[PDB]
Ligand binder design. Sequence first.
Ligand SMILES: *[C@@H]1O[C@H](CO)[C@@H](O[C@@H]2O[C@H](CO)[C@@H](O)[C@H](O)[C@H]2NC(C)=O)[C@H](O)[C@H]1NC(C)=O
Ligand SMILES: *[C@@H]1O[C@H](CO)[C@@H](O[C@@H]2O[C@H](CO)[C@@H](O)[C@H](O)[C@H]2NC(C)=O)[C@H](O)[C@H]1NC(C)=O
Ligand SMILES: *[C@@H]1O[C@H](CO)[C@@H](O[C@@H]2O[C@H](CO)[C@@H](O)[C@H](O)[C@H]2NC(C)=O)[C@H](O)[C@H]1NC(C)=O
Ligand SMILES: *[C@@H]1O[C@H](CO)[C@@H](O[C@@H]2O[C@H](CO)[C@@H](O)[C@H](O)[C@H]2NC(C)=O)[C@H](O)[C@H]1NC(C)=O
Ligand SMILES: *[C@@H]1O[C@H](CO)[C@@H](O)[C@H](O)[C@H]1NC(C)=O
Ligand SMILES: *[C@@H]1O[C@H](CO)[C@@H](O)[C@H](O)[C@H]1NC(C)=O
Ligand SMILES: *[C@@H]1O[C@H](CO)[C@@H](O)[C@H](O)[C@H]1NC(C)=O
Ligand SMILES: *[C@@H]1O[C@H](CO)[C@@H](O)[C@H](O)[C@H]1NC(C)=O
Ligand SMILES: *[C@@H]1O[C@H](CO)[C@@H](O)[C@H](O)[C@H]1NC(C)=O
Ligand SMILES: *[C@@H]1O[C@H](CO)[C@@H](O)[C@H](O)[C@H]1NC(C)=O
Ligand SMILES: *[C@@H]1O[C@H](CO)[C@@H](O)[C@H](O)[C@H]1NC(C)=O
Ligand SMILES: *[C@@H]1O[C@H](CO)[C@@H](O)[C@H](O)[C@H]1NC(C)=O
Ligand SMILES: *[C@@H]1O[C@H](CO)[C@@H](O)[C@H](O)[C@H]1NC(C)=O
Ligand SMILES: *[C@@H]1O[C@H](CO)[C@@H](O)[C@H](O)[C@H]1NC(C)=O
Ligand SMILES: *[C@@H]1O[C@H](CO)[C@@H](O)[C@H](O)[C@H]1NC(C)=O
Ligand SMILES: *[C@@H]1O[C@H](CO)[C@@H](O)[C@H](O)[C@H]1NC(C)=O
Ligand SMILES: *[C@@H]1O[C@H](CO)[C@@H](O)[C@H](O)[C@H]1NC(C)=O
Ligand SMILES: *[C@@H]1O[C@H](CO)[C@@H](O)[C@H](O)[C@H]1NC(C)=O
Lengths: 50, 487, 38, 198, 50, 255
Amino acid sequence: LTGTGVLTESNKKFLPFQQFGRDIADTTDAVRDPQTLEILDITPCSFGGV
Amino acid sequence: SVITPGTNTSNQVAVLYQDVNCTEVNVFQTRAGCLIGAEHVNNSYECDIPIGAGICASYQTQSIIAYTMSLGAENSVAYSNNSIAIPTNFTISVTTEILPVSMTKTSVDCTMYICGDSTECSNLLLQYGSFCTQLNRALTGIAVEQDKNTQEVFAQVKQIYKTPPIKDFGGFNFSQILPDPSKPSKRSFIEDLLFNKVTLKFNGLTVLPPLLTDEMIAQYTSALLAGTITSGWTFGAGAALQIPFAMQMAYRFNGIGVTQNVLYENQKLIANQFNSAIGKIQDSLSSTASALGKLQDVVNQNAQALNTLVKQLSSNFGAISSVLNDILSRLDPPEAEVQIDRLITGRLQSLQTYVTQQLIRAAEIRASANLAATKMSECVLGQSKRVDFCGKGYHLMSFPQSAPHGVVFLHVTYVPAQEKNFTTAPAICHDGKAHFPREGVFVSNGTHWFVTQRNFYEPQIITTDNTFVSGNCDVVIGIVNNTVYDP
Amino acid sequence: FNGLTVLPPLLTDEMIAQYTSALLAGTITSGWTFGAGA
Amino acid sequence: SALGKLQDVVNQNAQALNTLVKQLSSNFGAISSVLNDILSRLDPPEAEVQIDRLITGRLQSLQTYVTQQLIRAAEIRASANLAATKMSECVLGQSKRVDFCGKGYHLMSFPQSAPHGVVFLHVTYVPAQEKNFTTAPAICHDGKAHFPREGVFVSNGTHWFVTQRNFYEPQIITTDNTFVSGNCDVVIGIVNNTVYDP
Amino acid sequence: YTMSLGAENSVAYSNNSIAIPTNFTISVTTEILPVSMTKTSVDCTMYICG
Amino acid sequence: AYTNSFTRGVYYPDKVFRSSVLHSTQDLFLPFFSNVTWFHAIHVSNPVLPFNDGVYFASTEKSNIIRGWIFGTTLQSLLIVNNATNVVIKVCEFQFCNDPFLGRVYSSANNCTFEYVSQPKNLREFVFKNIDGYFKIYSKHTPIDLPQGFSALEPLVDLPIITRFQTLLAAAYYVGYLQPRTFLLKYNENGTITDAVDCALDPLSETKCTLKSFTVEKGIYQTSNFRVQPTESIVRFPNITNLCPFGEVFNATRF
Ligand SMILES: *[C@@H]1O[C@H](CO)[C@@H](O[C@@H]2O[C@H](CO)[C@@H](O)[C@H](O)[C@H]2NC(C)=O)[C@H](O)[C@H]1NC(C)=O
Ligand SMILES: *[C@@H]1O[C@H](CO)[C@@H](O[C@@H]2O[C@H](CO)[C@@H](O)[C@H](O)[C@H]2NC(C)=O)[C@H](O)[C@H]1NC(C)=O
Ligand SMILES: *[C@@H]1O[C@H](CO)[C@@H](O[C@@H]2O[C@H](CO)[C@@H](O)[C@H](O)[C@H]2NC(C)=O)[C@H](O)[C@H]1NC(C)=O
Ligand SMILES: *[C@@H]1O[C@H](CO)[C@@H](O[C@@H]2O[C@H](CO)[C@@H](O)[C@H](O)[C@H]2NC(C)=O)[C@H](O)[C@H]1NC(C)=O
Ligand SMILES: *[C@@H]1O[C@H](CO)[C@@H](O)[C@H](O)[C@H]1NC(C)=O
Ligand SMILES: *[C@@H]1O[C@H](CO)[C@@H](O)[C@H](O)[C@H]1NC(C)=O
Ligand SMILES: *[C@@H]1O[C@H](CO)[C@@H](O)[C@H](O)[C@H]1NC(C)=O
Ligand SMILES: *[C@@H]1O[C@H](CO)[C@@H](O)[C@H](O)[C@H]1NC(C)=O
Ligand SMILES: *[C@@H]1O[C@H](CO)[C@@H](O)[C@H](O)[C@H]1NC(C)=O
Ligand SMILES: *[C@@H]1O[C@H](CO)[C@@H](O)[C@H](O)[C@H]1NC(C)=O
Ligand SMILES: *[C@@H]1O[C@H](CO)[C@@H](O)[C@H](O)[C@H]1NC(C)=O
Ligand SMILES: *[C@@H]1O[C@H](CO)[C@@H](O)[C@H](O)[C@H]1NC(C)=O
Ligand SMILES: *[C@@H]1O[C@H](CO)[C@@H](O)[C@H](O)[C@H]1NC(C)=O
Ligand SMILES: *[C@@H]1O[C@H](CO)[C@@H](O)[C@H](O)[C@H]1NC(C)=O
Ligand SMILES: *[C@@H]1O[C@H](CO)[C@@H](O)[C@H](O)[C@H]1NC(C)=O
Ligand SMILES: *[C@@H]1O[C@H](CO)[C@@H](O)[C@H](O)[C@H]1NC(C)=O
Ligand SMILES: *[C@@H]1O[C@H](CO)[C@@H](O)[C@H](O)[C@H]1NC(C)=O
Ligand SMILES: *[C@@H]1O[C@H](CO)[C@@H](O)[C@H](O)[C@H]1NC(C)=O
C-alpha cells in the first residue's frame, strides 16, 4: 500500500471488517494502521503550478 | 437501445433493435429496426423521443406509444389574388435565448498525472520529448481562450453605466431584471434564478478560476442593461445619450415600420403587456427547470469527459497492475522498465484523447461565444432587422442577463395578432393617373377605400399626400378606382 | 458490414420535401409575415 | 502590437512545426533516435523491435501535429469566413448592424492586404459634443397631436424645434415635418405649440 | 490590484430630457483578421523512416 | 412452494470502504425478484435441500428456532451449530445421519480438521458463498412475505476452509440460489449500501447500470450489442486420407 501524503485522524466511519479504503478516483484514500487499527485518512501533499 | 419516459415519470420502458427484423427477436417494425414494448398508434404528434425514420415515441394515455411524427397543423392560408390580411392588434413577447460562453478552465499537471511523483516513471517519460509539455501548452491555450471569450462578449460597454434611482421608465417595470440593492450579490432577480437552476478532490487536474468573477460579470451586465434602458443604441456608437424610454421605444417601433404614434396611443397597454411577459419569463424559468439545458449540457459534458480521464487512470492497459508503486515494489527494475512503459503509453494516449476532445469543444464554444458576441452587438446595442436573428418576431430590443457560463438574452419581439381580411388593389386610378401608396398599402372593405400602414390597421383617407402619381392607369395589372382627395 | 452501420435520419426525405413545400407556400402566400407571426 | 492577432498564427504554426522537428530526437525509449545507428548496432531480429518502437512514437507525434493543424485550420477557416463576410458586407455595402463594421455608425470600409490576413480600415461616423434638451413625444395643437415625421422634438429651453435624430439641426415645426393623429389625450407628456402651416 | 471595469458614471436620465450630438468625428479603426496558415506538407515516409 | 424475493440478498462485496459513490460489481448475488423457496421449519411430514453457487437463507422466528446447518457432498462436511451461546463451526461431521434431527445430535463425527469457534416478528438472513478456498458467511437481521425493505448484509464470518445442505430445524425458512449477476451498488455518505440495481433485471435496470445512475432522464439510450450466438460448429476438411510420409524423412538410411 505504498504511497505519499499527509495522514490525518478522521471521522471516516470504516465498518469493523474494512481494512483499506478507496475514493471515487479509485486511489487509496483511507487506511487502517496495522499496528493499532486507527483510521488514517490520506490526502496528497500540497502541490501546483508555479 | 432502449427508449423510456424516464424514471421520474414512470418505470415503464420499450426497446429498439436497430437493424434486425422482429422475426429474429407487443411488436412493431420500422425502417429503424424492430421495436418491442411500444404500441404503434395511428394518429400523429410532436416527438417526445426520436426513434428514426419518422417514428417517434412518447408516453400517453398510460403506455409508451410510437407514432409517425406530425410536422404541424396543416392549414391552407387563404391566399388569393385581390386579397390581403392586416393585423389589427399586437402582442409583445419576451423569449429567452441561452448561449454558452465558456467552459471551465481545466489544467492538467501532465507529469503528475502520468507518473504520480515517481522518480522512475518521469525518468522514463522524459524519453518521450515534447509531449508532456505540449499538452500543457494546449490546455493553457484553451484556458486563455475562455477569458478571451468572456471579455469579447460582455465587455462591449466602454464604461459602467449606473442606472438612475427613480426608475420612472414610462410604466415599464425593470425591477425584475435590474440589480437589486437587497444585494445577495450584484446579481439581478432573474440572474439569481439562473445561478440556482443549474449546478455543477483531484490529482494533477485542477480548475483555474475565471478571470472575471461572477459578481463582476454581473456588474458588466448591469452596466449594459442600464445603457439600453437609458440611451438606446447610442451608447454603442458613442457616449451614452439620455433619452426618455418611451421615446426610445417609439424609435424602435419606427424601426419595424409601425408608425410611432401607434406606440403613444397605446403606451399604458404596451407596458402592461411587457411587464406580464417579464413575469412569464420569470415564472417559466422558476419551474421548467430543464430550460437551461443548453448550459447544463456543457457543464455535464465537460464533467463527464474529465471524470473519464480520472477513471482511465485506474486501467491496466495490460500492465501487471494499475498502480506504478504497486508494480515497482514487486517487479524487478529491468522488467518494470516494460510494465511502466505499458502504463505510460496507455495513460499518455488517454490524455491525448482528452486534450483533443477539449480542443474540439473549445472550438465549438468559441463559435458559440462569437455568436453570443454578435447577438449582444446587434440585438442589445442595436435593433437588428435580421428577420429571425433576435428571436421569433419583429425585433424591438433585447436585454442581457448573466448566467453561470453563458448569456440568457431576453429578446423582446413585437408579434402582430388579430388579423382582418380586406380586399386590396396595387394602385388607385384617378383622372387617369395611377396613384400608389407612398408607404402604406391600399385596402378596402368594399364600401370605401383606405390606405393603411403595412403592419397595423390604422386607416387614412386617401389624400394625394400619402400617395404619389405615376403611370397612366393602363399598365398596372389590377388597378381600382377611388376619389383621391387633395388638401 | 462488420461493426459499422448507418442510422437512418430522423426526418426522412419525404418530410424534408414537406417542410420545403411549406416554406414555399409560406413565402409565396405571405412574404416575410409568416416568419414573424401567423 | 496591433498586428499581434495576425502574428500569433504565424508563431503558433511555426511553433507546432518546430516541435514536430524536435520530436525526431525524442528517442521514445529506443536506444537512439538516429535510426541508422540502431540499424548498425543491432541485428535485424532485434532492430525490428527497436524500429517498431521508434515508428510508433514518430507516428504518435505526427498524428498529433496533423490533428492540431486540422483544429487550427478549422479556426482559421472560421476567421476567413468572417473576413469574407466583412469584405462583402462592409466594403461592398454599408451594413447597418450596429457593431460589426467597427465601432460607431458605419460609413465605409477599405480592405488592405497583410501577409496572411486582411486589415480593414473601417471608416465610421461617431457623434460628439452633445447638449441637453427638454423634449416631448408629441405637440398638441387644436387638440390634435402632431408627431415628428422623422426627427424628434426638442426645446431650446423655451421654443420647440424638430431636429433630426443624430445631429442637432433645428427646424420650425410645420405640417410637413410632422404628421397628425389622435386627440391630445391618449399620448402622455404632450406639450403645446403653434405648429406652423406654410 | 482588483481590476477596474471602467469609470462608473450615471447617464443623466430623466423622463423628458434628451441629449442630441451637435457635432461629429469621422474616424478610422483598423481591424485585423487572419485568412490563411502556411500550406505545410509532410512527406510522411521520409519523416518517419528517412 | 414459493415466494418471490424483493430487493434482498445484497452484501458488501469486497471488504473495501467506499462512500457517497456508485460502483459496479461482478460477484455472485441473489437476483432481484428471484423466487425463493419456502420450506417447513416444523417436521410436518423439513425437506433437505440442494446447494448450488451459494445460498441465500432467511428465517423468520422468535426464540432462534432455526439454530444450525450442515453442508457437504454426499453429506468431510461443514457443520454449524449455534446452541449454548457458541457458534461451533467444525468440519467434523463425516457421518451425518440420514435424519439430522436437532436434539440428541445431528451426526457422528471424527477427524475435526478445522474447528474454529467464535461468539455467535424478527427476520434473520444469511448468504453462504464458497470461493477461492474460503467460505463466506454474510449475515444481518432486523425486526419484522419477506420485507420489501432493502438490507445490506455485513460479513459475519469469512473462514479459510459442498453440494447439498440441511438445517437444524412456528418458524419458517426461505432459500434461494445466488447467480453471477452484475450489480451497481450505491453507497451513502456513511458508507452503508443504500440501494442497488440488478444490471439484468430488465432493460431499464440495464440502462440504469450502463449510465451509472438511478434516475434516467426521458430519452433514448444505447445499452448493448445484440449478437446472435452460433447454433453449431460445422467442420469440413478436404476429404484427405493417408498419413503423411514422415516415416521416411526422420528415418532415412542416410541423411
Ligand atoms: C389588443 O389586444 C389587447 C390584449 O393583447 C387587448 O387588451 C385586452 O382587452 C381585454 C378586453 O377589454 C381585457 O380584458 C384585457 O385586460 C386587455 N389586456 C390588457 C393587458 O389589459 C386590447 O383590447 C386589444 N385592442 C384592440 C384594438 O384590438
Ligand atoms: C368599412 O366598412 C364601413 C361600413 O361598411 C364603412 O363605414 C362608413 O364609411 C363612411 C365613409 O367613411 C362613413 O360616412 C359612414 O358613416 C361609415 N359607416 C357608419 C355606419 O358610420 C367604411 O367606410 C368602410 N371602409 C372601407 C375602406 O371600405
Ligand atoms: C434659442 O432660444 C433663444 C431664446 O432663448 C432664441 O432667441 C430668439 O428667438 C426668436 C425666435 O425663436 C428670435 O425672433 C429672436 O431674434 C431670438 N433672439 C436672439 C437674441 O437670438 C433663439 O432664437 C433660439 N435659437 C435659435 C437658433 O433661434
Ligand atoms: C465640430 O468639430 C470640429 C473638430 O473639433 C471643429 O473644428 C475645429 O474647430 C476648432 C475651433 O475653430 C479649430 O481649432 C480646429 O482646427 C477645428 N478642426 C478642424 C479639423 O478644422 C468644428 O468647429 C466643430 N463644429 C461645431 C459646430 O461644433
Ligand atoms: C422528480 O419528481 C420529484 C417528486 O417525486 C421532484 O421533486 C423532482 O423535482 C423531479 N425531478 C425531475 C427531474 O423531474
Ligand atoms: C424486414 O423488415 C423490412 C422493413 O421494411 C421489410 O421490408 C422486410 O420484408 C422484412 N422482412 C421479413 C422477413 O419480415
Ligand atoms: C390505421 O388506420 C387504418 C385505416 O385504413 C386501419 O386500416 C389500420 O388498421 C390502422 N392501424 C392501426 C395500427 O390500428
Ligand atoms: C414591479 O413589479 C413588482 C412585482 O414583481 C412590484 O412589487 C413593484 O412594485 C413593481 N414596481 C413598479 C410597478 O414600479
Ligand atoms: C379570411 O377569409 C377566408 C375565407 O372565408 C377564411 O378562410 C380565413 O380564415 C379568413 N382570415 C381571417 C384572418 O379572418
Ligand atoms: C385578380 O385581381 C385583379 C385585380 O383586382 C383582377 O383584375 C382580376 O380579375 C383578378 N383575377 C381573378 C381570377 O380573381
Ligand atoms: C374606373 O373608371 C373609368 C371611368 O369611370 C372606367 O373606364 C374604368 O373601367 C374604371 N376602372 C375599372 C377597373 O373598371
Ligand atoms: C445634462 O445635465 C446634467 C445636469 O442636470 C449634467 O450632469 C449632464 O452632464 C448634462 N449632459 C450633457 C451631455 O451635457
Ligand atoms: C416626470 O416625472 C415628474 C415627477 O417626478 C412628473 O411630474 C412629470 O409629469 C413626468 N413627466 C411626464 C412627461 O409625465
Ligand atoms: C395645452 O392647452 C390646453 C388649452 O389651452 C390646456 O388645457 C392644456 O393643459 C395645455 N397643455 C398642457 C400640457 O398643459
Ligand atoms: C415463481 O414461481 C412461479 C411458480 O413456480 C412461476 O410461475 C414464476 O414464473 C416464478 N417467478 C418468476 C419471476 O419467474
Ligand atoms: C478419520 O479418517 C480416517 C480416514 O478416512 C478413517 O479411517 C477414520 O475412521 C476416521 N476417524 C474415525 C474416528 O472414524
Ligand atoms: C450517518 O452517521 C452519523 C454518525 O453516526 C449519524 O448521526 C447519522 O444519522 C447517519 N446517517 C445515515 C443516513 O446513515
Ligand atoms: C470423399 O468423401 C467421402 C465423404 O463424403 C469419403 O467417405 C470418401 O472416402 C472420399 N472419397 C475418396 C475417394 O477418398
